[PDB]
Design a protein around this nucleic acid. Sequence first.
RNA 1: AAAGCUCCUUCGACGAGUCGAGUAGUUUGGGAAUGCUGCUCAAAAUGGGAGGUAAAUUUCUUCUAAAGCUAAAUACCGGCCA
RNA 2: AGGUUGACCUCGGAUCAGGUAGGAGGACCCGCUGAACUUAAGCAUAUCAAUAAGCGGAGGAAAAGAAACCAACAGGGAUUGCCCUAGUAACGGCGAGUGAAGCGGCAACAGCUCAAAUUUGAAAGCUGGCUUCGGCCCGCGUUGUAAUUUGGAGAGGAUGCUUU
Lengths: 101, 202, 31, 203, 154
Amino acid sequence: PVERTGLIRGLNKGHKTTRRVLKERPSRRKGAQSKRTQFVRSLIREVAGLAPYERRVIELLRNGKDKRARKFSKKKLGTFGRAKRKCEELQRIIAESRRAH
Amino acid sequence: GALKYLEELSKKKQSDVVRFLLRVRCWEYRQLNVIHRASRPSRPDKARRLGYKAKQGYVIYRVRVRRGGRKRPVPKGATYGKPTNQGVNQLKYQRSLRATAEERVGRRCSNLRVLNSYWVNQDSTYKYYEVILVDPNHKAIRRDPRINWICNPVHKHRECRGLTSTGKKSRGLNKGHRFNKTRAGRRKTWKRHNTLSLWRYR
Amino acid sequence: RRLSKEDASRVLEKTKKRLTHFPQRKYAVKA
Amino acid sequence: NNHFRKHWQRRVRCHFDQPGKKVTRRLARRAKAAALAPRPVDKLRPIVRCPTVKYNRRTRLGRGFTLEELKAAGIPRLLAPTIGIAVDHRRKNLSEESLAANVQRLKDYKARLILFPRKSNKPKKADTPKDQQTAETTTSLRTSFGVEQPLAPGFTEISKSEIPAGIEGGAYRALRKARSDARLVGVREKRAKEKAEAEANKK
Amino acid sequence: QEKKERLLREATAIKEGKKKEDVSKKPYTVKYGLNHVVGLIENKKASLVLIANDVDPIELVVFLPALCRKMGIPYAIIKGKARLGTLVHKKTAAVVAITEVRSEDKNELAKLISAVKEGYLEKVEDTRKRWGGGIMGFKAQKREEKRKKSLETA
RNA sequence: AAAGCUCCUUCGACGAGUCGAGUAGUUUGGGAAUGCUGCUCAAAAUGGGAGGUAAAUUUCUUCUAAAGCUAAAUACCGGCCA
RNA sequence: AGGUUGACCUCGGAUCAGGUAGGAGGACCCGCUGAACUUAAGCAUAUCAAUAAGCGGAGGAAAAGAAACCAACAGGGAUUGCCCUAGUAACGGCGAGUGAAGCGGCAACAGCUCAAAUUUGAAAGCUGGCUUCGGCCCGCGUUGUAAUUUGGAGAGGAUGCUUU
């Protein structure tokens, strides 16, 4: 951590203390991938396949219409960030299928 | 074990296998009675994470409720007061259909306690729920410290007072700035804010 | 209809272990 | 500005029971002290610094000691609430000074603690011996372990040869420069990035 | 009764100051229970898996052929959760697994595994990927046959 | 037999028609920033929520929802005793 | 004997064995539903009021509660209540009006249980019946009942002392 300047205003303001490095709390591990969860999600994806909107986005990405895919994914899911993450995941699925075939 | 796989598969509700199972089970539950007893949970992982155990004293009841909005039972569907700029087709019930289902199952089995409930199916007319109930008079329940809190008389009809999960959601019992009006109880908070307090040495 | 005293006083094994090894101690603090 | 347009007479709370409630509270405190004797009536609390820029000049009592403070004091987290120490698992030690202060607080409390054995006929080596069990005790940890110095001292004296030179240009100019730099941190970064890109393009 | 007798023998051995493993040998039993068998398949301890064909809800065992195919475990779908319950002293059993057998039955286990591999899995290798159902009723089938005959005649 | 303390390569499962989005009604000081419910869409894995002005990009800070229990300080035009 | 004999699953019957709910009370408490008089010159936003009436459900308290919190600090640390914040931030036809929260002082303080893991060298768990009170049976349950773990961590190792 950067040492504070000792002033009331400006960049890095505030009273100077000796900041410590904390061992990370186990409640902050949420979101990390684990081997069992990765394995189970991969098997369930193989068993269950895709949603119809996911098939539509995959077809748009295969046709190369990336702006169409992002707009349709935003309409289907709700938010721009979720649409972007879904488009990246489906592009990874398409790339894996292409490298398999 | 298998319940991790069941949770991951229950996430994929638009897949072919889950859609087929939902279709056939929706037909079967529509053929059955509006409230009826289920021999075992149809979603065992969901029931287990909501608190069901395969123990003498836990029962599962399935219930369907008519979905949509709420109608005010005025004659001819029209009010005789000041104009409202809306129709009775657009009134909204402040509790959930899940809560209505839990109330009706509790009235069907008034000797039991409603623990929780979960969605299982829906169509255009109905939403379908499964309610977990506990027998407070069964001694297998009464000897178990994880569950025998429900045998106390303060937990009579939690679904009627909004003490289940859907009731807590509807009452808005969460911490922070978005739930200022409701987190301690809305009417209680209103009474506290509208009480005139007069001290002796004022 | 009240729970019997034995059923009301039943505890889990983890709680029993914690109470066995770390109960509420008698103590005093000097001034 | 009179908010009397609701049915206010239904919700008037008078306080004629103020001395009676004080008497009831004192009776409850006496009963709790008699039930808890010879332990103190309250738990040991840490020293914390109040948040916000308005109140960070002052220290007060916190909820409970941290797990790091208990570990550095050598008190296990299961033993701590059974000998009159409050534990707070949410609070962290972002800086060394508060950690050191609360660790010293725990060590002073541990040095002043008298621990009676669970069985009188079979004492253990962690227990206080019977010859040392008799001493003049305290029953208010909020009093004997309060906040001794809640604010900084408002007045000290130094020699005239130890007067600091001060910040160059003056404190007012230093404050103005700090505010200006904070307001222009992004513009200067963008200008430097554009200049570096132009230098890379036309090197 | 067998467990009670074994515990009596172990208690006598403890009384005379011997370990329970001195009078108790290593057991070889059919492994059962869905979570237990799933963990055995995931750790590749199971040598053969038998899955009941009539599990309701079917989601409990719907992923199990894919799990066994991913972990390389020989499996077979078999008729009767009640039939497996007769094996494991229960009313029903969703799945059973053989991990290890005795040395006098190792050859029989290998022969059964090879027979399963050659006579069930290779025979259902192509039919397991096909869609099921889609069968018409008797009267609809007769109506469609009559319609096709009329279309062919005219 | 159970339990506590110290260290560590490693591992470290964490709640789905739910969150969220749109729309409608209602509600709120939160008629740009509130909550609840109905309908439609419908997630993710350092992910997700929040950070009271809409959005894209890059950071940061805080927690860890969708399961559950718990005394006291608080209320009391009902009942009982004073 | 196999056109038999059974094992399960689902669904029923019984004045079967043992249990449980209803109604009263409702001052206070948890929800649902829900006005108008009034105040705005009148008056469909608004105000009265998220009130009265109506409906459901509890207890000696109820509810809330151990952060998907507040913050932006040198950081606080479950919930409740008083004082203050504060008639402030903010909302509001044609304006009458409405209106919180964080911090801070105090009263009182208390913390925890599950699901997601294979006991797998042994369902170690439990209702009921009969008991000579030693137990023995009918069963529930592997589509999971005990032990273990709950993020503050934990699991696996290592290590040497303490604990009941």
